[PDB]
Amino acid sequence: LLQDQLQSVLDTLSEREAGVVRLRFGLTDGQPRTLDEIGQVYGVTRERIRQIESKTMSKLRHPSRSQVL
Amino acid sequence: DWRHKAVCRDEDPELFFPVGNSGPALAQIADAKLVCNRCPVTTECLSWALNTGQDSGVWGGMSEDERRALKR
Numbered sequence: 001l002l003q004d005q006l007q008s009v010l011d012t013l014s015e016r017e018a019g020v021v022r023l024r025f026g027l028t029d030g031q032p033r034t035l036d037e038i039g040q041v042y043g044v045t046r047e048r049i050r051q052i053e054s055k056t057m058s059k060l061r062h063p064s065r066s067q068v069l
Numbered sequence: 070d071w072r073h074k075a076v077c078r079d080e081d082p083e084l085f086f087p088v089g090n091s092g093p094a095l096a097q098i099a100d101a102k103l104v105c106n107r108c109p110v111t112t113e114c115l116s117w118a119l120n121t122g123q124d125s126g127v128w129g130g131m132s133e134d135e136r137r138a139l140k141r
């Protein structure tokens with residue numbers, strides 16, 4: 001479904017960025033984590049999480065990629 | 070829909086997300102804009118990126134810094 005393009009976008013990020021997004025969206029174990037929990041696991045600020053999320057979403061929604069109906 | 074006519078669907082998506090090291094990726098930004106310059110939906114793409122607030126990447130023939138400069 002969306003998995004293919006989403007995993008494709010995750011592949012373009014660093015391991016740490018991709019971990020941050022997987023925890024934020026609950027992709028790996030089905031449990032989205034809070035900003036506090038993510039900042040504790042990967043040692044990143046809330047503004048840095050915001051930027052990672054924003055960048056990932058721009059990549060996912062860019063017209064270069066087919067979108068999910 | 071305009072996304073149907075995006076010529077960047079035939080490109081490496083990462084072309085449109087340049088990262089620089091100690092400065093702007095001037096060449097990669099130009100390379101992305103070159104695709105936008107042969108795209109029939111540059112204006113719709115730029116309008117959508119601006120209206121939905123896409124911060125990262127090249128959209129509608131504009132770099133991320135250029136769209137940021139337009140915005141408040």
Ligand code: SF4
Binds near residue numbers: 085104105110114115
């Ligand atoms: S203007 Fe550029 S980013 Fe937008 S659809 Fe066309 S090629 Fe893709």
